[PDB]
Design a protein around this nucleic acid. Sequence first.
DNA 1: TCAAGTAAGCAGTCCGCG
DNA 2: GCGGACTGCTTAC
Length: 903
Amino acid sequence: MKEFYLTVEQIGDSIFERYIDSNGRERTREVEYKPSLFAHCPESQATKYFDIYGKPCTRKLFANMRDASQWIKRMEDIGLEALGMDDFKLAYLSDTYNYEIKYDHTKIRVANFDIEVTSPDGFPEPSQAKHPIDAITHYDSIDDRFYVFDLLNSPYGNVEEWSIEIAAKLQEQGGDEVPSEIIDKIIYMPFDNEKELLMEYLNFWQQKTPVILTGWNVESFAIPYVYNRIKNIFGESTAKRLSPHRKTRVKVIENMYGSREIITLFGISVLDYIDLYKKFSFTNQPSYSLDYISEFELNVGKLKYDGPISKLRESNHQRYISYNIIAVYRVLQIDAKRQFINLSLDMGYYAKIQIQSVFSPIKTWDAIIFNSLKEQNKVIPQGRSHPVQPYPGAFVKEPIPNRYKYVMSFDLTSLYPSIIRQVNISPETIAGTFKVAPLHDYINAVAERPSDVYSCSPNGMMYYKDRDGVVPTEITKVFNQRKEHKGYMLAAQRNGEIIKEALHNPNLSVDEPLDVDYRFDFSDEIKEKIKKLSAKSLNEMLFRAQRTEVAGMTAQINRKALINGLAGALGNVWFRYYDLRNATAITTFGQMALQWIERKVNEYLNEVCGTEGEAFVLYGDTDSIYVSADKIIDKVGESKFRDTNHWVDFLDKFARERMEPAIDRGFREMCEYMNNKQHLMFMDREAIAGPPLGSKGIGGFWTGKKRYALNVWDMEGTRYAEPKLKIMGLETQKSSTPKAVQKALKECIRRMLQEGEESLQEYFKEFEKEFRQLNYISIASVSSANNIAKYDVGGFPGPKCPFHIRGILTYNRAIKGNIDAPQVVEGEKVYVLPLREGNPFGDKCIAWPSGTEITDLIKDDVLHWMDYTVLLEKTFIKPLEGFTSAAKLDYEKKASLFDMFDF
DNA sequence: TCAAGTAAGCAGTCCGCG
DNA sequence: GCGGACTGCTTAC
Ligand SMILES: O=c1ccn([C@H]2C[C@H](O)[C@@H](COP(=O)(O)NP(=O)(O)OP(=O)(O)O)O2)c(=O)[nH]1
Ligand SMILES: [Mn+2]
Ligand SMILES: [Mn+2]
Ligand SMILES: [Mn+2]
Ligand SMILES: [Mn+2]
Ligand SMILES: [Mn+2]
């Protein structure tokens, strides 16, 4: 097989590499790497190396990496550019793997671990590590085994061995319900003292040294705890055995509120699953506890136990170990669904970077572009420092707040990358400038054509047409992957809807789920077979279709994020190819494109409807338009339509056959106007929205920019079995809104759009009547706890103190003197509840760490003093009043003359 | 040599207000 | 009490 790297590190003048050889064996080597950098040379000099602007360079080959670094500094002191890749391990990777890397994941050791530490005196701080590690479960992907290290004797209690027999039993039978499918994969190892546990763990680690190291909060808790615990018991050099090269660094991570200390283990690639989840999931969760996320992702139940975790080992050691094991499995289950590890490996090897560098779009693109240029013997420019400058972005149209009955939306495919490709925007394709007219003159086609010769953006930039830039070239390759995967996602989605429609009428028999590839639209033959299947088989097929869809979503959305990341990186001062001329060439072109096509669509629709000057486009954000289809429907009638699906079919066909060619004609004209390299403005129909035929539903509404709701029947060719609410920006979509309130507001919206005013009013009255019975957690707001200390003046709120911070301070005063109460961690999320006046907490609100029950000490007081009236008014009524005023209706009737006896 | 972007809405505090 | 000038948090893109 072809060779691939596992990890790479630079240590002094040495590159340390772990890799898979031609026989598929893991190896390690230390290389005294001889890097090259480049300097501009005279035209007289015969060379094969040119910078990106075609200027000749001379290669400087150095005896070691230290000498290369010194030369860089000398060059800066002289005042001359030092060209080439200054991150030497990327150069090493590029030289060592001078081909497209095909990796074999089964050869890569992926480890997933979780540790338990009993602490009777608060959170066990990793920097101190003053408490015994009393459990470690470590799953190894190569062995496919969960290795469990269990401490039986400690200063906080001596316990008996954990029972696998009891572990497998159902909870309702006194067991722990450790999933049956991993019971046979457990290797259990009890220890009578911590020293031998930790020593065995280190020996084990040497035999099975992780390449990718993952888990939940491993980077911030487990890794530094283990390192420091070992350091404190055995000494520093023993703790350095966690690194295959015996080198570690206490690294300081900094943000706008403070800093934290992690441990870099050289020769390991740490991908903390919490960080993978935050980057790749595109959710914003009220809580990031593993229990909460597992429940969200997998619909598993909460792992129940009596008392606090600080006393769980002593009271129920059996469950303690079982839950440690299950926690490791939960991350494996989340990854089996989401496939973030596979994504990271794909991306890391594609770029030729350390796998952990997938967190940095800038590092990823620097490597991709370097490797692309190196292949053509081109030399990359030196990184330069730049002051941060604000610059303009997208256009957002101001909507008229209103109900909108029939709506059809259109959206530009991968806009910013498509602009890069159409215009041919790259550092080395810049051709010059032209004199800019006001943007509205380009939008209206009244400004003179910028150039007959070059490809243009309305920001004043011109680009060469007759050759590709490295940025267009490399962005295209990733875009084409994104397109492939999105196609798989949408087919899986379409397939799901077919299955959902068959679930309406089973059809009782004993059969099997059909073996199909869900990534491609089912054939007629498969569709026929599906109609004959049982509910059990269909539900299994639906599960598989949805998992295929999530896999396609993971693969497409994050490749989209990566290419959009390249467009944004052009506006980040740390990017080697930073250039506001290129960043603004993109954003300005986008503003023009949106507003240009708004005009063209309004023009076209007026024309076909036999009218003049009517406004069809009601809204647009960056690269979308929302078109009022009321006149299109009215042109026909109502009541020419048999059912809802009839008018949906009509609008679908109208969009594809009529509007789409006009949109394309429109964008082709704009492409000729800007004299661009390639026409790539492709605006697909997205949503078809409206009320059920014959209902009193309002279809949709807008309250303002980035705030709207639509009752959608078809989305990008997915025809829903049941209408789906598309809600953007409203409180239902915000993680700060209480769970039960998100639910109630969504139902209010559903009733508005599908059923009408009376149905809304009916629901509002019931919810108001029953609000006070909802579980306190379901009605608590959520916020991030940033800059707590800043506002803490002797335990009390300082000036400007945010509401949620005041809550934290109230909590801190309430728990002072209790070592068992969970501390609010700076930057994490909290639940927030308002308190009635005269409460014993002495303030108007309280806040506690989210995803948790509030500590039992003050629980009863919080419940007693909660202000339901303020809760209702702030989280539910205020937003609902915004929706209903926009939509021109009332959530309450509503005094009128009709005061007689209407029974 | 660590290091995608801008636009924009709502909720809160502070403070003015015979 | 409201509305305006800020911050803080958050979402759409
Ligand atoms: O995270 C983002 C999202 C959008 N944008 C910009 C770039 C993107 O091309 C543009 C339009 O946003 P869309 O949500 O329409 N995504 P895009 O057009 O890139 O892909 P598509 O619409 O094909 O899923 O807004 C970003 O810069 N960062
Ligand atoms: Mn014993
Ligand atoms: Mn645990
Ligand atoms: Mn788009
Ligand atoms: Mn699209
Ligand atoms: Mn869009």
